[PDB]
């Protein structure tokens, strides 16, 4: 197999405090086909200015999606000890066709800090962590999401500077706050702004160590690290499962501004995945260090006929969903974004 590096030296995991109500927030995040945000670009076909209709996995228009955010643990001003995560550990979502996430939209704007409503800081872009498993089972403590057999864990490393992907069988450990251990509440990953995220120093091991404390890694098929790029601009990440291999698409790799999806990595997993988990990451920081955090939003891909318009650059800037809206279905007919006024029968 492939070495996972040194195992956690701490038998007891860091204690976890769950505050779902604080994490919950009210905001509007509706995908728009005309904007073309959340619309994938097909690697298989490249087209010129003329518009064409193609069938591909696409999120339905008007989907708010699932809002996922990470917050700093409860901390005294001198010392940060507790870890804060919403109950997404016990929340399991089926991996029916994969999902697309949007990151950095919140960043570049000032918002109330998630842990403390009174505190307000400029929002900072964050990278989501996704663990996918064919079978998910409840832990001995009774917390859900302890799949154990799950083989597809992707977590950001060096405070999101690089992405780490590995498939391993999770091993339960006996320690305070560990899943098979005493005082088990949740499993989280901690990154520290003062040392781990200090400018010029990024520690991939610190994020890996937090995951190791909760779960040891055994039977590890492969280790993958992608440096990619980090910037405070809107980015889209899409994960899809195909018969040949699991395919990973990132907007940042090709055009960050375009938002178009281009495959950047290929994962050799031929096992069907029926479940996934999102936002298990947590921040370890003092009260002054805490800042508003950007969030990751899940949009489920589904087979969907779509009208696509490609500009002179060739990137799609206009899209129409035939399924949603009678007028949009009429627009798909005649292969025209604008249709002459008429009375038309609909299903």
């Amino acid at each position: 197999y492939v070495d996972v590096g040194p195992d956690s030296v701490k038998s007891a995991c860091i204690e976890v405090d769950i505050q779902q109500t604080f994490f919950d927030k009210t905001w509007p995040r509706p995908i728009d086909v005309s904007k073309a945000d959340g619309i994938i670009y097909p690697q298989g076909r490249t087209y010129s200015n003329i518009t064409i209709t193609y069938q591909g996995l696409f999120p339905y228009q008007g989907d708010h999606g699932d809002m996922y955010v990470y917050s700093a643990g409860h901390a005294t001003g001198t010392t940060p000890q507790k870890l804060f995560v919403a109950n997404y550990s016990q929340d399991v979502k089926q991996f029916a066709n994969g999902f697309v996430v949007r990151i950095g939209a919140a960043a570049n704007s000032t918002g109330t800090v998630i842990i403390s409503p009174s505190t307000s800081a400029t929002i900072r872009k964050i990278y989501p962590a996704f663990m996918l498993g064919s079978s998910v089972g409840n832990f001995s403590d009774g917390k859900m999401g302890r799949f154990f057999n799950h083989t597809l864990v992707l977590l950001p490393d060096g405070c999101g500077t690089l992405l780490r992907a590995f498939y391993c069988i999770l091993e339960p450990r006996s320690g305070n706050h560990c899943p098979a251990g005493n005082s088990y509440t949740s499993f989280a990953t901690y990154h520290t702004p003062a040392t781990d995220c200090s400018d010029g120093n990024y520690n991939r091991n610190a994020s890996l160590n937090s995951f190791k404390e909760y779960f040891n890694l055994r039977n590890c098929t492969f280790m993958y690290t992608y440096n990619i790029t980090e910037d405070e601009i809107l980015e889209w990440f899409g994960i899809t499962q195909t018969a040949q291999g699991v395919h990973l698409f990132s907007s940042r790799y090709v055009d960050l501004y375009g938002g178009n999806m281009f495959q950047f990595a290929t994962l050799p997993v031929y096992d069907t995945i029926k479940y996934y988990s999102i936002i298990p990451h947590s921040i370890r920081s003092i009260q002054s260090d805490r800042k508003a955090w950007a969030a990751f939003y899940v949009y489920k891909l589904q087979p969907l006929t779509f009208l696509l318009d490609f500009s002179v650059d060739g990137y799609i800037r206009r899209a129409i969903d035939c399924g949603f809206n009678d007028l949009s279905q009429l627009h798909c007919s005649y292969e025209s974004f604008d249709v002459e006024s008429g009375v038309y029968s609909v299903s």
Epitope: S11, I14, E15, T79, P80, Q81, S174, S183, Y184
Partner: antibody, heavy 130, light 110 residues
Amino acid sequence: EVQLVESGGGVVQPGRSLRLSCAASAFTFSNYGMHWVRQAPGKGLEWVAVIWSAGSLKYYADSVKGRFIISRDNSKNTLYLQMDSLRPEDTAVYYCARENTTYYYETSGSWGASYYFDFWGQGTLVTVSS
Amino acid sequence: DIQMTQTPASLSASVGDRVTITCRASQNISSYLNWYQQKPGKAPKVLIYDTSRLQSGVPSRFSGSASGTDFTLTISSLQPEDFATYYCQQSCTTLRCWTFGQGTKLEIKR
């Protein structure tokens, strides 16, 4: 506020199984691990058995292997310890107590006490005699 | 395994006196050494755990200092109430077993 009460401690014939029950009042037994300590007269307290809050893994002292069985029922709020093949030397006072791991992360010379050893169990004296 | 011996064993200490109680540490692999103050007929009361904290209700005069392989408990302004048996146990993440305490009760000089 937390109260620990121990029952089932009594004089027992040698080689006869005995059941010890520890009950927690106003205590989060479901999310707290339990550590058992035995005191021998004229000697210091020594840990004998630990029951995880999850209860998946239970650890026992090298001297007693399979002699001590620890069962933690969250709904009951009572922890059951089973002692078998008891001997005159084994006679001791058994206390059920909760220990919280002390962890300090020095991001900037930062230390966290992380201590919850308060409300030590009163303990029950069990004598092996006939 | 862990082998722990307290070199003083019993301390003859007068009131308002300074005494040091030294107990050896079996291994430097684990840095967690803790001191427990026990009153006879009563459960032990924690004094120190990571050696960086002072228990609430415990005076500053009681202090725990570890040098090399030996950890010493330093007590000042000793009182008849202060005198008690003391157990120091090594705590190891790798080893499930917890170290026994020899016991160091303090008699009063007269």
